[PDB]
From a paper:
3FTxs, non-enzymatic snake venom proteins, are the most abundant toxins found in elapid (cobras, kraits, mambas and sea snakes) and colubrid venoms. Structurally, all 3FTxs have a stable fold with three β-stranded loops extending from a central core containing all four conserved disulphide bridges, resembling the three fingers of a hand, and hence their common name. Despite overall similar fold, 3FTxs recognize a broad range of distinct molecular targets resulting in diverse biological activities. In continuation of our efforts to understand the relationship between the structure and function of 3FTxs, we isolated, purified and determined the complete amino acid sequence and the crystal structure of a new three-finger toxin (hemachatoxin) from H. haemachatus (Ringhals cobra) venom at 2.43 Å resolution.
There were two hemachatoxin molecules in an asymmetric unit with each molecule consisting of residues from Leu1 to Asn61. Each monomer of the asymmetric unit consists of 6 anti-parallel β-strands (β2↓β1↑β4↓β3↑β6↓β5↑) that form two β-sheets. The first β-sheet consists of two anti-parallel β-strands, β1 (Lys2-Lys6) and β2 (Phe10-Thr14), while the second contains four anti-parallel strands, β3 (Leu21-Thr26), β4 (Ile35-Thr40), β5 (Ala42-Ser47) and β6 (Lys51-Asn56). The fold of hemachatoxin is maintained by four disulfide bonds, and these cysteines are strictly conserved among the 3FTxs. The electrostatic surface representation shows that loops I and II are predominantly charged residues, whereas loop III is highly hydrophobic in nature. ESI-MS, Edman degradation and crystal structure data indicates that hemachatoxin differs from cytotoxin 1 in two amino acid positions (Leu27Met28 is replaced by Met27Leu28) and hence are isoforms. Hemachatoxin shows highest similarity to P-type cardiotoxins. Similar to these P-type cardiotoxins, hemachatoxin has the conserved Pro31 and cytolytic site. The three-dimensional structure is similar to P-type cardiotoxins (RMSD values, 0.8 to 2.1 Å for 58 to 60 Cα atoms; Z score values, 12.2 to 9.8). Nonetheless this analysis suggests that loop II is flexible and may remain flexible until its interaction with membrane phospholipids.
Residue numbers in the entry:
A (entry chain A), B (entry chain B): 1 to 61
Write the structure that this text describes.
Amino acid sequence: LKCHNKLVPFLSKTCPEGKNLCYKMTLMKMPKIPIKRGCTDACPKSSLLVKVVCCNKDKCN
Amino acid sequence: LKCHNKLVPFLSKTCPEGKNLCYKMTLMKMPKIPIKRGCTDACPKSSLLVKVVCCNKDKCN
């Protein structure tokens, strides 16, 4: 799997064994700006301030 | 281990087996506001926009 791993566009990495999900964190009030992206094994939980998208195709985050 | 797990004060949970670190995410420009907190096994990486503290004593985050 390959995921975007920076908050600028395009850049990516191949995920390590065990992490088969891409994730994207955004501020709930600003959905257009990724604040943190990368690979993960289990999808991180959202908070009152942060939304977390998880997806499992290449560069889907 | 017990960690703060919300961005309001006080609230906490006991970490599941395998997660022996507390973490706190902040926006690099706003260190005073936690945007996401909880338990983790390996300390999450920082990004250009987000700082991540990790610590291993009770409610240290």
